[PDB]
C-alpha cells in the first residue's frame, strides 16, 4: 500500500492574472512536480486568494492516454482534486489544472 501526498494550490493575482504557487505539507514552496515510487494518491487543495471564485473542474492532459495517471477525482465544492496513480506505467506526464471562475465564463488553466 502506498503514499498519500498533499499539495496546496495557492492562487494569487498578479498583473490581474492568476499565479499558482504550490506548497508542501511542511509549508514550503515547491515546483509542483512529483515522483511516484509506488501506487498512491496526490491530493491537491485549492487556496484561492484571487477573489475570483475559482473552483477545480478537472485536471487536463495533452497526453491523456499515456497511462501515467489512472484517474482524477474531484469534490463537490471544487476545492479538492485527487489523482490516482497506480504506478504500473513508467514515464512522465505533464498536466494542468482546469478551473471555473465567477468573473466570467472562460476556464482557467494553470501553466503548461
Amino acid at each position: 500500500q502506498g503514499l498519500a501526498q498533499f499539495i496546496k494550490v495557492n492562487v494569487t493575482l498578479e498583473n490581474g492574472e492568476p499565479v499558482f504557487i504550490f506548497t508542501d505539507a511542511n509549508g514550503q514552496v515547491c515546483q509542483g512536480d512529483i515522483t511516484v515510487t509506488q501506487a498512491g494518491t496526490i491530493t491537491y487543495l485549492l487556496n484561492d486568494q484571487t477573489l475570483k471564485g475559482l473552483k477545480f473542474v478537472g485536471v487536463g492532459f495533452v497526453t491523456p492516454f499515456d497511462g501515467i495517471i489512472d484517474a482524477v477525482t474531484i469534490s463537490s465544492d471544487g476545492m479538492l482534486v485527487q489523482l490516482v496513480d497506480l504506478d504500473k506505467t513508467p514515464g512522465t506526464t505533464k498536466f494542468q489544472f482546469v478551473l471555473s471562475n465567477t468573473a466570467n465564463t472562460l476556464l482557467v488553466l494553470s501553466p503548461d
Binding site: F22, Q31, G32, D33, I68, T89, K94, S110
Partner: peptide, 7 residues
C-alpha cells in the same frame, strides 16, 4: 506540473 512514474 509534471508527474514521473517509477514502479
Amino acid at each position: 506540473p509534471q508527474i514521473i512514474n517509477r514502479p
